Ligand SMILES: CCOC(=O)NCCCNC(=O)OCCO[C@H]1[C@H](O[C@H]2[C@H](O)[C@@H](O)[C@H](O)O[C@@H]2CO)O[C@H](CO)[C@H](O[C@H]2O[C@H](CO)[C@H](O)[C@H](O)[C@H]2O)[C@@H]1O
Ligand SMILES: *O[C@H]1[C@H](O[C@H]2[C@H](O)[C@@H](O)[C@H](O)O[C@@H]2CO)O[C@H](CO)[C@H](O[C@H]2O[C@H](CO)[C@H](O)[C@H](O)[C@H]2O)[C@@H]1O
Ligand SMILES: *O[C@H]1[C@H](O[C@H]2[C@H](O)[C@@H](O)[C@H](O)O[C@@H]2CO)O[C@H](CO)[C@H](O[C@H]2O[C@H](CO)[C@H](O)[C@H](O)[C@H]2O)[C@@H]1O
């Protein structure tokens with residue numbers, strides 16, 4: 001899957017359908033994987049740099065692949 | 070959903086029906102989403118500023134949407 | 139439910155039946171709610187002040203309601 | 208159950224059958240309770256002193272009772 | 277099982293099939309154990325030294341055994 005954005009996690013949002021939105025770079029993206037919820041929040045809290053991989057590389061787009069650096 | 074309150078998390082409470090109550094701004098609110106329990110506690114512990122979105126914007130009211138900043 | 143004890147968590151104990159015991163104030167109490175295990179450990183580790191609410195307010199008594207301050 | 212060892216968690220090990228091994232005092236012990244995995248890793252990380260209770264107080268022996276101090 | 281690599285966790289990656297990849301030493305490896313996801317991310321965040329034990333000791337190989345030092 002292609003790289004989409006890389007950056008620190010500007011903010012996260014828990015959504016009304018139990019998905020989890022994230023803002024990284026200039027993109028707001030979401031993931032239906034519940035596993036990623038607390039990893040992403042930890043990244044946000046500790047100031048990790050993450051890379052998100054997705055073909056739906058647009059605001060509102062979905063993702064499931066993330067790299068924690 | 071409309072913004073309801075924004076602030077740091079004043080306190081949380083685990084309830085007898087496994088719901089989780091949170092005090093943010095001047096509102097005490099609850100969420101039946103189990104997934105939010107540890108996110109909300111981490112936010113509380115680290116001093117994050119959260120925004121809760123809900124149409125039931127009164128003490129005792131329910132929520133599922135939260136933004137972690 | 140009435141207040142039972144208020145204090146920092148002196149120590150916790152994982153029990154052989156997968157319940158979790160906590161010492162707060164002068165009381166040892168337990169909870170069969172798995173969700174509370176890591177919340178109570180976190181409170182212990184970070185020195186949070188908790189309040190436990192239970193009508194079984196004696197050593198060995200059960201609880202499910204906790205306030206995290 | 209009798210006390211078996213007391214000390215800081217020298218190391219943990221995740222095992223091929225999803226059990227979790229821990230080195231405390233002079234004993235290596237394991238637990239088949241999944242709930243304890245992240246508690247024991249948090250105790251290791253923050254330098255908590257634990258006591259493990261078990262009748263199988265020998266290397267390789269099993270446990271489910273832990274006290275977090 | 278034989279030792280494979282030892283080191284700090286250079287990066288992790290959540291994969292599209294809910295497995296978790298990890299870079300330690302000169303090897304990129306994955307595990308299908310969901311339990312290990314947040315343990316390995318904690319090790320990464322806190323700068324723990326891990327050892328991975330696997331007979332598939334090449335890039336892209338699988339593991340389930342980790343030692344946290
Ligand atoms: C005032 C003293 O009494 C109480 O405070 N009682 C609290 C308990 C009863 N709670 C309750 O009924 O919650 C459900 C109704 O509340 C949810 C609210 O529903 C809206 C509905 O969607 C609207 O279209 C309609 O006009 O009215 C009601 C209320 O204004 O919606 C909000 C979000 O917009 C909450 O739902 C969210 O939280 C709960 C709990 O976490 C639940 O998951 C929902 O799935 C989630 O959306 C209110 O609870
Ligand atoms: O031999 C067991 C196996 O033991 C594991 C152990 O859990 C770890 O400490 C170690 O590192 O790896 C050893 C070697 O395998 O555990 C599995 C299940 O988790 C099997 O255990 C069951 O088998 C027995 C037959 O009844 C007995 O009841 C065990 O106590 C069961 O749990 C395997 O046989
Ligand atoms: O392919 C497996 C690997 O299989 C071994 C098998 O263990 C040997 O007895 C055989 O002779 O050699 C094959 C090939 O290496 O087992 C390794 C660890 O020894 C990996 O297996 C683990 O990883 C998997 C995905 O993480 C899954 O968790 C397995 O259950 C683990 O055993 C490798 O993938």
Ligand SMILES: OC[C@H]1O[C@H](O[C@@H]2[C@H](O)[C@@H](O)[C@H](O[C@H]3[C@H](O)[C@@H](O)[C@H](O)O[C@@H]3CO)O[C@@H]2CO)[C@H](O)[C@@H](O)[C@H]1O
Nearest residue numbers: 095096097098099123124125126127128129130131132
């Ligand atoms: O028996 C349960 C409960 O019933 C009554 O309260 C009702 C709702 O439960 C309560 O949420 C609601 O609160 C109102 C405030 O009073 C109102 O001023 C504010 O604008 O919003 C909320 C919700 O719309 O009130 C109703 C009844 O009007 C009972 O009154 C209460 O004691 C409690 O027993």
Ligand SMILES: OC[C@H]1O[C@H](O[C@@H]2[C@H](O)[C@@H](O)[C@H](O[C@H]3[C@H](O)[C@@H](O)[C@H](O)O[C@@H]3CO)O[C@@H]2CO)[C@H](O)[C@@H](O)[C@H]1O
Nearest residue numbers: 154208237238239240260261262263264268269270271
């Ligand atoms: O976590 C793994 C395992 O831990 C606990 O069991 C311990 C040993 O695994 C087990 O073999 C041991 O059996 C005891 C009996 O209780 C006792 O009656 C008998 O006489 O002696 C044996 C061997 O010494 O018990 C210990 C701790 O008491 C846990 O209870 C168990 O379910 C399992 O998780």
Ligand SMILES: OC[C@H]1O[C@H](O[C@@H]2[C@H](O)[C@@H](O)[C@H](O[C@H]3[C@H](O)[C@@H](O)[C@H](O)O[C@@H]3CO)O[C@@H]2CO)[C@H](O)[C@@H](O)[C@H]1O
Nearest residue numbers: 154155156157172224225238239240241242243244271
């Ligand atoms: O410490 C908490 C808990 O962990 C251990 O059980 C594990 C999971 O927590 C549990 O939900 C899971 O149960 C399996 C059943 O064994 C199986 O019959 C069914 O088909 O699938 C479920 C859902 O996965 O199993 C694991 C352990 O294999 C621990 O043994 C348990 O008693 C308790 O302490």
